[PDB]
Design a protein around this ligand. Structure first.
Ligand code: IFM
Ligand code: IFM
Lengths: 807, 807
C-alpha cells in the first residue's frame, strides 16, 4: 500500500487470530462489550508479541558476543506513543492495517487512544528518545537508564486564557509495553554517616530504598535488534518504619522518589537530589553486575561506556569511585583512571540559572560519603591546575568544584568535566561557546576532552511515522534506503526543476494542512483557513525562545491591516504552543498574552480570515507529529547565543517547512547545509549581542525610533488587549522596557522585514516549493543516526553496524 | 491418578504448549534464565486461561436470564492461594501435574511460591471466602464486594520469643488472578455539607475519591459457573489539590483508603470509617447500574439481595436511602420499604468491645447527609417502639440507634437490625443468645427477623485440596458425590468396624503427620517426634480463646513428668499458632509465654521427646492447610458463651482430629451430630458461667484448693520460665488472679482430667481411629454448601442449583 511494508495473506490471517486471542484471554472481553480502548490494547499486545522473540534473542546475543556496553543515563526520556513506531520498525504497519480493516476497525482511530509516555519536559528528553531509536538501528549494545515516573509532564489546560496544570496519570489504564522485573530489585542507600576503620571508610546507619526495574523494548529499524530501556521505580522495604497503621502509610515517603517528573531555573530541592542519586546508584549496581558476568577492573573501560546526559546523573562519578574504593578496595588512582575512562558528559545549555549547584549541607546529610569523595576529587584536581598554571590564584577559585559564598555549593558541571574523558556540546556554535567562555579554563587545562556532537532527530518517527505522504513520494524517486541513511535525500536535488515532484511536494503539504485543519475543528472546535500560510512556533514557553517577539510581529500585522483594510496581505494562521513551568510567572503571562491577542484578532470583522492567532493547547510529542507536517513556516527565533542546539528546527526542515531563524544553535548548520539563500535568517549574531551588552542595552532607544513598536507598547499598556483589566500586561511591558535579558526590541525591525520576505515568497507557490525541496534535500546531516555514529566512534570507541540479526 | 481428574493425552499436550507460550510471550523469559517463580507464573496464567471463557459465558448468562442478584458485602475476604483451588474446581489437577512433570517440574514446588491473598484477619474473612466458593458451586448469581487492600494481614515474625509485624506486600510480584477494570471507575464523596432546597436535600462541596474495581474469578466446583469478586481500589482524581509537586505527592492521602487492612477491641479511627463508606458507596452504584439494565424500584427487592457481613458495611442502609430519596426522588416510606426488603444482617459476636459505635462528631464531618438520615431512621423507629410498648421509657433509650453520654455515638448494630428484614447469628447457641440477651428488645418488637445460620467450611479447600489422601480413601468406598454433597459422608458409618478402612484412615493421618514433621524441619529447622499425639490450637491470640488454659495444661504435664520421670506418659507435640493484634499487649504476652515454656520444656533432658511445645509462626490459610490434616487433637476451649461459632473446629473434624472443647459456639452442634460420647467435652456450660458471675468470680479460691495450680502460678511469679527477667510474667499472673474475664481457673480441673481421657484413648490406636471415623462421618452439616443453601432459601429468596453450565 505504501512504504509501510507488505500485507501478506499468511501474516494478516495470523495477526487477526492473535488479536482475537488477546481480546478474549488477555483483556477478558467479548466483541459485544468491547470499546475502542479494548481494541487498542488488543492490537498493542499482538504487536508486542512480535518484539519479545527478538528482544530475548538480542539480549542473549550480547551475552555471548560480550561487546562493549553503552549506558545512557538520563532523568528524562520523552518517548511519546509506541504502537506505530513499533509497527514501522518491525515492518508490520500495512499488515496490521489490513488485519484491523478486516476485523472492521480503523487503525488510525485505535492509535489515538494510546497515551503519550511523557517522561520528559522537552528537547533533552526527546533527544534521549531519538538517541535510543538510533542506537538500536545502528546495532549498538545500548541501554537507556532512568526513572519510571508515575506522573510525567503535566497536562496543560487553558482556562480563561490561563494555563492550568493537570496530573498526567499515564499509567491509569496500564502500560502494555513495559515488563516489571521485581526479581531484579536492588537496594539504594540514603543518609547515614561515615565510619573510618582499619581498612578504609564505611557508610553506615543508612536508610534503604528499593529500586524495582521496569524494562521497555527499543526496536531498531528493520534489523531485528531490540534493546532495553530500564526505568527504576522506588519501593519501601518490608520492615520500613517497622502505630502499625502509620508505619504502613509512611511507606509513601520512600516511594515518593519516583512519583513525579520535575518540570523545567535551578531549584535545590531534596527530592530532586534523591531522584538523581536513586537512578545513579541502582544503575551502577546493574552495570557492575553485568560486567562481573563478562575481578580486574582494568578492563572496565573496555566493556563499559557511561554517558551522562546533562549534569543530572553527575553523582555517577563519585558513586563509581565509592564502589571501586570502598567496596572493591581498589587504590584511589586506579579507581580514578577507570572512572575518567568510562564516563563522558554532554552539556545542554549556557544559561547560568540552569547550572546545577547543590548546597553542601544537603549533600552532607543525604550523601555524606559522596561529599568526602567530592572534596578529595577537588583537592587532587586543583593540585593539577596549580602545577599547570603556577601562581594563578583566581583560576584556582574559578575552577574549583566547591563554590564558596553565603552557602557553600558543589558545581556539578565542574565535577563532570574533571571525571570524564569527553565533554561535548550539542551544536558547533554551542561547543565553541563552551571552549571560549563558560569552560575556557577547563579547555586550557585539557583541550583534548572537548568535542562537538550536533544533535539530530530520528527519521523514523519524524518522517516515516508522522508524514507517510512525503515519505512515499520520496521513496518513489530514490527508494527506501534513505530511512536509515538520510544523507541519500541529497539525491532529491536533481528533482528541484521536476514539475511532477514540485506538484507532489506541494500536494502532500496541502493534504497535511487540510488534515490538521480538520483535527483543530474536531478536537477543539476552532476554525482555520487551510489556504493560509501556517506560521508555527512550538516549544517550551521561555523568555529566551522569544514567543514575545512573535507576538510583536502578529500585532504589527493586525495594526497594518486595520490601517489599510482594503490592501492585500498574504493570509496567515499563526500557531503557538508549549508549556510554561508552573512557577515561571512571566511564561504564564506570555501564554495569557497570546490568547488575549487571539481574542482580539480572531473576532475582528475587518481582519476576516486573513489573520488568525491560535494557541496550541497541551503541546507534546503526539501533537508535534500532527502540526509539524502541516507547517509552512518554522519559527526558530531565540536570541543568538541562548539556544544550545534546538531539535524542533530539524523536524520542521525534514517535513517541508521553511525556517525563519536567528544564527543560533543548530540553525547555523542547517542554513550552512541548505545554503543561506534558502533560509530566512535575520537579526543579531552572537558578536552583535556581545557588542550590545558592552555598550549597555537600552530598550527605550528602540521604542523612541520605531513608531510601529511604540504603538504596540502603548496598546499593551493602555489595555487594548485587556479591556476589563487595563493593567493586566504591566509586568510584560515593564520587563521589555527595563529588564529584558533577551533583547526582544533589538531584533524587532529585521524580524518584521524578514517576515515580509517570507510573505512575498509565499505568493509564488512554485518558488516556495522549490526552496522547500532544497531544504528537505539537505536535512540529512540532522539524522540522529549521524549523531550517534559520531558518539560511537569518537567517544564510546565502538563501531555501528547496519547488519541484521536473524529473525 | 486420584480424585484429581483425568490426564488425557490431548489435554496434557495442550497445557504444555500454553505453558511455554506464557513463559515466552507473557513472562518474556527463556528456559535458561527462568526461576521456579517464573514457572509458577507460567502455570498460573495457563490455568487462568481456562477460567475466562467460562467467566465471560457465566456473566453473559446472568445478563440474559436476569436472575435475582446476591451482593455479599464484607471488608474482609481471606482467600489464601488460588492456583490449586482453581485446578480442583476445573478438574485440571492431574492434567497439570502430568504436563508439568513432563516439562521436568514439580507442581507442589511451584504451588508453594504463590503468596496468600491475606485480605482478612481470621474467621470472618475466611467465612466470606468459603461462602464465595459455595455460592458459585450452588449456581447462584452472587458477587463478593470489598476492598483491594494493598497490604493484607501482617506477616508475623517471632524474634526472641516476641511477635514482630512485617508489611504483607502481597502484590510485589503481581497478581495473575485479578483483572483491573479502570473503565468502570466510580466516584465516592466525602465531607461537604447539606443544602436544603425546593425539592429536597443536596449534598455539596464534597471531596471526590475514585473507586477503581479489580475483578477476580470465583469458580464453582465442576459446574462451569464462574462468579465475580470485585474489590475496589482508591484513586485520586486528576485535578486533586489542583506548589505543583506537593499537589501531586498529596494524592497519596486519598489513596490511603485502600492501603491497609485494619487488624482485629473497637477503635473509632477516621480512615476505617472512610474504608467502610468507600466500599458501600462504590458497590451500591454498581448494584443500581446493573439493576437499571434489568425505573420502578418496587421490583428492586425482587432482583437484589444485599448481605451485610457484620456491621462493617452498615452504611449501606442510609446510603441506599440517600440514593433513593435524594437522587431518585422516591418518598421516604417507599424507599424504606425497598431498603428493609433488600438488606440482611449477619451478627458475628457477643463481645461488647467488638460492637461498632461511631462518634456522632465524626459522621457529622465525614458524612453529614448520612447522619441526618440516621437520625430520621431512629425517630421513626422509636415511634414504633413507643406505640408497641407505651410508657416503657427505658426500652426507648436501650433501643435507640443514638447512644448518649460523654460522646454521642451511633450504634451500628441497632441500625442494621432496624434496616434489615433478617438478622442471623452464626450458630444455634449464638443466635439464641442474641434473642435472649443482647438484642432481646429487638426480638420482642420483631420476632420474625431473627434467624440462625450455622457456619460451615468448603469441603473443596478443606478436604480435597489439603487432604487428598483422605479424600481418595473416602472416594474408593462411597464415590465422589460427597464433594458437593457432604451429607453423603454418613455412609462411612457402615465402615466403622471395617478393618481395611480403619487401617487406611490411620495410615493417611500418619502420612500427614510425617509430611508436616518434615516441613517443620525443612522450613524452620525444628525437630518433632511424629509418633506423638499432635495436640494443636491454631487461631487468633485472644484471652477469650484461652490459649492460656492450654499453657496451664502444658505446664501441668511438664511438672508431672519432673515429679515422676520414670513413669510412662503418652508423648505429645503441642502446637499453638496465631497472630496477636499489634496493640493488644496481653495477647503479645501470651505468645511470649508460649515460647518461654517451649524454651524450658524442649531442652529438659529428663522430658526427652515425650513432650514438645512449638509455637507455629505466621499462621494463615496456607499454613492451616498443612497443620489441620496433621492434627490428632483439636483444641476448641473458649469460655462458654464467648465464641459465636468457630470454623476452625469444623476443619479439624473433617480432617480426622478429635475435639477437646467446651459447649460453645458450633462445638455444641458438632458434638450433637457425632454424639457426645465421640467428643471430649469439658467445663462450664453458659448457665454455669452466669451462675459464677452472679456469685462473683474469685480466682483465689481455685488457687487455694488446687495444689497443682498453685505450683504453676508460683513458677510463673518467681521467674521459673524467665530466669533473666523474674517478673516478666507479672501482668499475666495478676490478670489471672484478679482481672480474668474469661475464668481460666474455673475450667482448669475438668480440662486437665478430660485431657487424661484423651491420652488414655490415644494408647488404643484402633479405638481412637474408630471414634475419628465417627467424627468424619457426621461432619456433613458443616459444609458451607448447607449454610449457603439456607441463606438462599430462608433469607435471599432464591433456589440453589447443581445444574452445570455448558463448557
Ligand atoms: O540538547 C537537547 C536540547 C537541550 N535544551 C536546549 C536545546 O537547545 C537542546 O536542543
Ligand atoms: O462467623 C465467623 C467467625 C466470626 N468471629 C467469631 C467466630 O466465632 C466466628 O466463627
Amino acid at each position: 500500500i505504501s512504504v509501510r511494508g507488505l500485507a501478506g495473506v499468511e501474516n494478516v490471517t495470523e495477526l487477526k487470530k492473535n488479536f482475537n486471542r488477546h481480546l478474549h484471554f488477555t483483556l477478558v472481553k467479548d466483541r459485544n462489550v468491547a470499546t475502542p480502548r479494548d481494541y487498542y490494547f488488543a492490537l498493542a499486545h499482538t504487536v508486542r508479541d512480535h518484539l519479545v522473540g527478538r528482544w530475548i534473542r538480542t539480549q542473549q546475543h550480547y551475552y555471548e558476543k560480550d561487546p562493549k556496553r553503552i549506558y545512557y543515563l538520563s532523568l528524562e526520556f520523552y518517548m511519546g506513543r509506541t504502537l506505530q513506531n513499533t509497527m514501522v520498525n518491525l515492518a508490520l504497519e500495512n499488515a496490521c492495517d489490513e488485519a484491523t480493516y478486516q476485523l472492521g476497525l480503523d487503525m488510525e482511530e485505535l492509535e489515538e487512544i494510546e497515551e503519550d509516555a511523557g517522561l520528559g519536559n522537552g528537547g533533552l528528553g526527546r533527544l534521549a528518545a531519538c538517541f535510543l531509536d538510533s542506537m538500536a538501528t545502528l546495532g549498538l549494545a545500548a541501554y537507556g537508564y532512568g526513572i519510571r515516573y508515575e506522573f510525567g509532564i503535566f497536562n496543560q489546560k487553558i482556562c480563561g486564557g490561563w494555563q492550568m496544570e493537570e496530573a498526567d496519570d499515564w499509567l491509569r489504564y496500564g502500560n502494555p509495553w513495559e515488563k516489571a522485573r521485581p526479581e531484579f530489585t536492588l537496594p539504594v542507600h540514603f543518609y547515614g554517616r561515615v565510619e573510618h576503620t582499619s581498612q578504609g571508610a564505611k557508610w553506615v546507619d543508612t536508610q534503604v530504598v528499593l529500586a524495582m526495574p521496569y524494562d521497555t523494548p527499543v526496536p531498531g529499524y528493520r534489523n531485528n535488534v531490540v534493546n532495553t530501556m530500564r526505568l527504576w521505580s522506588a519501593k519501601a522495604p518490608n520492615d520500613f518504619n517497622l502505630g502499625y497503621i502509620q508505619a504502613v502509610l509512611d511507606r509513601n515517603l520512600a516511594e515518593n522518589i519516583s512519583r513525579v517528573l520535575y518540570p523545567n531555573f535551578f531549584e535545590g530541592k531534596e527530592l530532586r537530589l534523591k531522584q538523581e542519586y536513586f537512578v545513579v546508584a541502582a544503575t551502577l549496581q546493574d552495570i557492575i553486575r553485568r560486567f562481573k558476568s563478562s575481578t580486574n577492573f582494568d578492563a572496565f573501560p573496555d566493556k563499559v561506556a557511561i554517558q551522562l546526559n546533562d549534569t543530572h546523573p553527575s553523582l555517577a562519578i563519585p558513586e563509581l569511585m565509592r564502589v571501586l574504593v570502598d567496596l572493591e578496595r581498589l587504590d584511589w588512582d586506579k579507581a580514578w583512571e577507570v572512572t575518567v575512562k568510562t564516563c563522558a558528559y554532554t552539556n545542554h545549555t549556557v544559561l547560568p540559572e540552569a547550572l546545577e549547584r547543590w548546597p553542601v549541607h544537603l549533600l552532607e546529610t543525604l550523601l555524606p560519603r559522596h561529599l568526602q569523595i567530592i572534596y578529595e576529587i577537588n583537592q587532587r584536581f586543583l593540585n593539577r591546575v596549580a602545577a599547570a598554571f603556577p601562581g594563578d590564584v583566581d583560576r584556582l577559585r574559578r575552577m574549583s568544584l566547591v563554590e564558596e559564598g553565603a552557602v557553600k555549593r558543589i558545581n556539578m558541571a565542574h565535577l563532570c568535566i574533571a571525571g570524564s574523558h569527553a565533554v561535548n556540546g550539542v551544536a558547533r556554535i554551542h561547543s565553541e561557546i563552551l571552549k571560549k567562555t563558560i569552560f575556557k579554563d577547563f579547555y586550557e587545562l585539557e583541550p583534548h576532552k572537548f568535542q562537538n556532537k550536533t544533535n539530530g532527530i530520528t527519521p523514523r518517527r519524524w518522517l516515516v511515522l508522522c508524514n507517510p505522504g512525503l515519505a512515499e513520494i520520496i521513496a518513489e524517486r530514490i527508494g527506501e534506503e534513505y530511512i536509515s541513511d538520510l544523507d541519500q535525500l541529497r539525491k532529491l536535488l536533481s528533482y528541484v526543476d521536476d514539475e511532477a515532484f514540485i506538484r507532489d511536494v506541494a500536494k502532500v503539504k496541502q493534504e497535511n494542512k487540510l488534515k490538521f485543519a480538520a483535527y483543530l475543528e474536531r478536537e477543539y472546535k476552532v476554525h482555520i483557513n487551510p489556504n493560509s500560510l501556517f506560521d508555527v512556533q512550538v516549544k517550551r514557553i521561555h523568555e529566551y525562545k522569544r514567543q514575545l517577539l512573535n507576538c510583536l510581529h502578529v500585532i504589527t500585522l493586525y495594526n497594518r491591516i486595520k490601517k489599510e483594510p482594503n490592501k492585500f496581505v498574504v493570509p496567515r494562521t499563526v500557531m503557538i504552543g508549549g508549556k510554561a513551568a508552573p512557577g515561571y510567572h512571566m511564561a504564564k503571562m506570555i501564554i495569557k498574552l497570546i490568547t488575549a491577542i487571539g481574542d482580539v484578532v480572531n473576532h475582528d470583522p475587518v481582519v476576516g480570515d486573513r489573520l488568525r492567532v491560535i494557541f496550541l493547547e497541551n503541546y507534546r510529542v503526539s501533537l508535534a507529529e500532527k502540526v509539524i507536517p502541516a507547517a509552512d513556516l518554522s519559527e526558530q527565533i531565540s536570541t543568538a547565543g541562548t539556544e544550545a542546539s534546538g531539535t524542533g528546527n530539524m523536524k520542521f526542515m525534514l517535513n517541508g517547512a521553511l525556517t525563519i531563524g536567528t544564527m543560533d544553535g543548530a540553525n547555523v548548520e542547517m542554513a550552512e547545509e541548505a545554503g543561506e539563500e534558502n533560509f530566512f535568517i535575520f537579526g543579531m549574531r552572537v558578536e552583535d549581542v556581545d557588542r550590545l551588552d558592552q555598550r549597555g542595552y537600552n530598550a527605550q532607544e528602540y521604542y523612541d525610533r520605531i513608531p510601529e513598536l511604540r504603538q504596540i507598547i502603548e496598546q499593551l499598556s493602555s489595555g487594548f488587549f485587556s479591556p476589563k483589566q487595563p493593567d493586566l500586561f504591566k509586568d510584560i511591558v515593564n520587563m521589555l522596557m527595563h529588564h529584558d535579558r533577551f533583547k526582544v526590541f533589538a531584533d524587532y525591525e529585521e524580524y518584521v522585514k524578514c517576515q515580509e520576505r517570507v510573505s512575498a515568497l509565499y505568493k509564488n507557490p512554485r518558488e516556495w516549493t522549490r526552496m522547500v525541496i532544497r531544504n528537505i534535500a539537505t536535512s540529512g546531516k540532522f539524522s540522529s543516526d549521524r549523531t550517534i555514529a559520531q558518539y560511537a566512534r569518537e567517544i564510546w570507541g565502538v563501531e555501528p553496524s547496519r547488519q541484521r540479526l536473524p529473525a
